[PDB]
């Protein structure tokens, strides 16, 4: 054996130039695509915002046109989903996470268009759903689609191009090169066996992806919290406690996100119509709150800066938290296309700010600034729910640029994964796959 | 498949006991790594104090500079060739092998030899990192607790060993992330599955990084402030720089191995001729650490200065070449100490240089040499060691200029690409593929 190794070692890191080139095209496409998707979700959330003003006089008329306009989008979304591609529904990550394990199919001739358009509708509607899902999936199906076209064989080209397209997608959705790579090699990839994935080919993809993102949406960040304070050594324990909170809570949320999935399934019983209806119903509830209380609805970003700056009273926070927990479950558990990643970023930010405000009181001698805890807990749910901290932390760090909080950011995120494990928690993305897999090897 | 469904539902559940030892391996590697760091100081200082003590007589100094350092280097190589021949060299391949079970973790030896043998080599002022000494001491600490409290299973043996490996590289660069990333990208078994608790590692690294802080906080290792940004139309300049490090990286890899052979002749394996050639090279440094501080030393002190652009283009090429030499000698002459850090210094200099030529040819890009410095700082770590994702997150943590990330990647990537197509090989892997085929005859 110590013979073969010696041979392999001398042969390490030598991915076929051909794979290293397609990675360059999967990325360029996922990027151009992810951008086009992003631009679309804009034009829509806007055309809507434009019509509320167009009739700004008549109040009830608005609450209606807000609900209607969004309901009509959500519906068109769920339709395309239940009609042509039931995988497009939900997050869209587990489907790719499964596909890497060869346990799921990558029907791109369907998913690409369904996930895309079905997404604009769900996002343009203003629902509480991320973008990762839509682009991480579209990401992969792009990989597979080039893998097939130019045709390429071997478990590598099939795992590689699929994994690079998965990452390049999560990159252009958060403008976070690193976080992309890190997500693949920590969550997406086969968790229990070896797998021939060119980590170098991935980079090439992510980069080519991130450049396209920049070429069109540069000179403006997604989140701006400026340079908050630093974390004195004697204030680190406060981040371990916060980490515990997200730790016990993370799983509880994981239960609700699954339970609601069952429960909500009743209502339409699988009926393409009752579903598409309950769709427009929830998609409308959002197009309305996206007005009466912008915080409760929407993707989640707009409010992160404001929550971190400390512009919400403690009361207003608890509300927004709870209101969100609800709106996020509905939209995601109701099998609508769109990630659940980002909305969890918003939930931690709010639960963090809150913890922050209580801290800033009990400890005047620590000269705290609520903001630190916001940024500490921002990827804490990504850690207690999805149970993939190393990615959560490098994601936040890339969007908030406050590297001096890294120690607290880790202690929080870590403590979270620790308290989530000891309380029966499970990787929310893995469970969803273990259930979509089970159910299949159930209906036999 | 059905099993997968079962496993999935069981993912990420590392035994509370492992998750606790990780906490102790880290605390120890940290306290240790700090103690080592403090020692290498007291020495480089006691020396600097004696040069002044006789500041009048010039030749006397050049001598006492050479002597004082020669006497340290020797005491270093001795402890090495005498009680633990693995302590010699970097010290990473040995742990990288140990994870593959292909090498032994003789801690009852390595800990004390690597440690004291290091203070001697570093205190001497030679061109060698600290990663090696602490990455190794790191692992041997893991194994040492693994044995003491006694723990079985391939996991606890791979985990605690891998956490102590990372916790070490963390307290050596105060870079929590880079640590974790190094394990799960280079140190870990590159061609088969391996039960390593990534969560247990974190706990280690953190506990390690806190100890580092507790003693050396309020002061960074590298301060380059906030340099400019990289306009989209200036990205290609980083691909070209990436190509340079790409063709060069392997060439350096050859010299680092060849010099290892060649230098071996001179002492022929003779514990004495070796220990002598040791103090010889260790003296050459204690002297340059005076006549030309840049050529000698660990490498940090000069990174800020090279980045700020305080060296003329001439002075750079010199320092580059002078270094390439001094770095090969000290590392190829099997002395204890990493080669990681010194490569950080080499990229910084080759970057600044590329930077200055750029700042000329393109006045319309409003460049600032510094950006290229910070871009190429982890470029060697990418063309030589061929582990970019770690190089990049390491620089990013020490330089804190996240707005350069895109250029940092394009450079580092292009490097690994140009190194591959030119037959390059993971310098850490090659050294093991030798350590292994040697133990096979």
């Amino acid at each position, epitope marked *: 054996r110590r013979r073969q190794l010696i041979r392999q070692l001398l042969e390490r890191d030598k991915t076929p130039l051909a794979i290293l080139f397609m990675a360059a095209v999967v990325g360029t496409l996922v990027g151009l695509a992810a951008v086009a998707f992003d631009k679309g979700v804009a034009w829509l959330q806007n055309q809507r915002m434009g019509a509320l003003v167009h009739t700004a006089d008549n109040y009830p008329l608005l609450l209606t046109v807000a609900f209607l306009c969004s309901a009509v989008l959500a519906m068109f979304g769920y339709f395309l989903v239940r009609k042509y591609a039931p995988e497009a529904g939900g997050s869209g990550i587990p489907e790719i996470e499964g596909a890497l394990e060869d346990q799921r199919p990558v029907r791109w001739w369907r998913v690409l268009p369904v996930k895309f358009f079905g997404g604009l509708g769900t996002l343009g509607g203003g629902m509480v759903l991320g973008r990762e899902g839509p682009t991480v999936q579209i990401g992969g199906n792009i990989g597979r689609m080039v893998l097939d076209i130019f045709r390429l064989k071997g478990d590598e080209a099939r795992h590689t191009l699929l994994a690079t397209g998965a990452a390049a997608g999560l990159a252009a959705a958060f403008n976070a090169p690193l976080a992309g790579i890190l997500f693949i090699i920590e969550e997406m990839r086969p968790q229990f066996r070896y797998t021939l994935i060119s980590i170098k080919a991935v980079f090439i993809g992510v980069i080519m992806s991130t450049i396209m993102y920049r070429i069109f949406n540069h000179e403006v960040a997604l989140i701006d919290v400026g*340079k908050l*304070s630093d974390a*004195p*050594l*004697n*204030t680190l324990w406060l981040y371990l406690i916060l980490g515990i909170i997200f730790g016990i809570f993370g799983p509880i949320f994981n239960k609700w996100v699954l339970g609601m999935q069952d429960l909500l399934h009743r209502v339409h019983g699988g009926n393409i119509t009752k579903w598409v209806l309950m769709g427009g119903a929830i998609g409308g509830l959002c197009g309305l709150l996206g007005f009466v209380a912008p915080a409760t609805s929407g993707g989640g970003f707009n409010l992160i800066p404001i929550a971190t700056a*400390g512009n919400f009273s403690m009361g207003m926070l608890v509300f927004i938290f709870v209101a969100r927990v609800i709106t996020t479950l509905l939209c995601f558990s109701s099998g609508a296309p769109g990630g659940i990643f980002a909305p969890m970023l918003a939930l931690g930010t709010v639960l963090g700010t809150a913890f922050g405000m209580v801290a*800033v009181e009990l400890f*005047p*001698q*620590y*000269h705290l*600034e609520a903001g630190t805890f916001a940024i500490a807990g921002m990827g804490a749910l990504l850690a207690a729910s999805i149970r993939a901290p190393l990615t959560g932390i490098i994601l936040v760090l890339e969007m908030t640029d406050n590297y001096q909080l890294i120690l607290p950011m880790i202690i929080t995120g870590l403590g979270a994964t620790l308290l989530a494990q000891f309380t029966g928690g499970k990787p929310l993305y893995s469970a969803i796959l273990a259930r979509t897999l089970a159910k299949q090897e159930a209906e036999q | 498949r059905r099993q997968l469904i079962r496993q999935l539902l069981e993912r990420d559940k590392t035994p509370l006991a492992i998750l606790f030892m990780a906490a102790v391996v880290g605390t120890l590697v940290g306290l240790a790594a700090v103690a080592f760091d403090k020692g290498v100081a007291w020495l480089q200082n006691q020396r600097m104090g004696a040069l002044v003590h006789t500041a009048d007589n010039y030749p006397l100094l050049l001598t006492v500079a050479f002597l004082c350092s020669a006497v340290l280097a020797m005491f270093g190589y001795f402890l090495v060739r005498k009680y633990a021949p693995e302590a010699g060299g970097s010290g990473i391949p040995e742990i990288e092998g140990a994870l593959e079970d292909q090498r032994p973790v003789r801690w009852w030896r390595v800990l004390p030899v690597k440690f004291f043998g290091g203070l001697g080599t570093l205190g001497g002022g030679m061109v060698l990192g600290r990663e090696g000494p602490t990455v190794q001491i790191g692992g041997n600490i893991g194994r040492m607790v693994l044995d003491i409290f006694r723990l079985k299973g391939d996991e606890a043996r791979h985990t605690l060993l891998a956490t102590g490996a990372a916790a070490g590289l963390a307290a050596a660069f105060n870079a929590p992330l880079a640590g974790i990333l190094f394990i799960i990208e280079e140190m870990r078994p590159q061609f088969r599955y391996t039960l390593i608790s990534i969560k247990a590692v974190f706990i280690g690294v953190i506990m390690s990084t806190i100890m580092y802080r507790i003693f050396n*906080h*309020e002061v960074a290792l590298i301060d380059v402030g906030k340099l400019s940004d990289a306009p989209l139309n200036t990205l290609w300049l980083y691909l070209i720089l990436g190509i340079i490090f790409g063709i060069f990286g392997p060439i350096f890899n050859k010299w680092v191995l060849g010099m290892q052979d060649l230098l071996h002749r001179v002492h022929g394996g003779n514990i004495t001729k070796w220990v002598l050639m040791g103090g010889a090279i260790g003296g050459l440094c204690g002297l340059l650490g005076f006549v030309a501080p840049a050529t000698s030393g660990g490498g940090f002190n000069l990174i800020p200065i090279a980045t700020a652009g305080n060296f003329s283009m001439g002075m750079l090429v010199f320092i580059f070449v002078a270094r390439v030499i001094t770095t090969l000698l000290c590392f190829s002459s099997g002395a204890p100490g990493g080669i990681f850090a010194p490569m950080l210094a080499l990229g910084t200099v080759l970057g600044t240089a590329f930077g200055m030529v750029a700042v000329e040819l393109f006045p319309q890009y409003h460049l600032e040499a510094g950006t290229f410095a910070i871009a190429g700082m982890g470029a060697l770590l990418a063309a030589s060691i061929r582990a970019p994702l770690t190089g990049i997150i390491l620089v990013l943590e020490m330089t804190d200029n996240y707005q350069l990330i895109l250029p940092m990647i394009i450079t580092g990537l292009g490097a690994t690409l140009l190194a591959q197509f030119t037959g390059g090989k993971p310098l850490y892997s090659a050294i093991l593929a030798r350590t292994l085929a040697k133990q096979e005859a």
Partner: antibody
Amino acid sequence: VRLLESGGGLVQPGGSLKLSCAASGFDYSRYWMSWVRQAPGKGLKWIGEINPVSSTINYTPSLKDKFIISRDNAKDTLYLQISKVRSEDTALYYCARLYYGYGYWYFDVWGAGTTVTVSS
Amino acid sequence: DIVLTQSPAIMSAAPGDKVTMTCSASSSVSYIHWYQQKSGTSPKRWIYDTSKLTSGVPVRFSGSGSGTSYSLTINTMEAEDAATYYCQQWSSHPQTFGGGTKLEILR
């Protein structure tokens, strides 16, 4: 890094003055500024303090508005407003920068200190 | 608001001579700090975090303690040590200072 304080002088019991501290030598933001005073022939007693962004100001136990502290991050100046002055306000006032090691804040750098005499 | 009580209100020592002074709290405190104050001039941060000396402070100094009693020491105190030392604490809001100790020179 220098910390200049000016504005102290003579005042009538009952009146009010505005002390000023000009900061040179360090990025005045990111810091916490605080005032400490010393009655001739007595120890040091802390008056109050303020952070960067100016969204937090704490004072020692005093009346509803006995003291008003503020800072213009723009002019690199720290002010102190004392009102309804008794003669217990007759003291030497110092401004200071605030920092820490572990996290138990100390008074980093002080200033010469201007004098306030409260008399009729 | 804790109440730190400096020890010898006043006290003189000879040049080259070990000196100690106390700062007994009225409750737990942690990593108290010490300040030096020369007639007519602004306070200086000497010892900080119970023992950690300040960048530039003369090595003859050392300070320690815990819980409720802390102390400053001059291992052979010279003249440029003749001043007034104040201990401060900020382990619990609001911060507080001691009565101060008058280190006068004996000759």
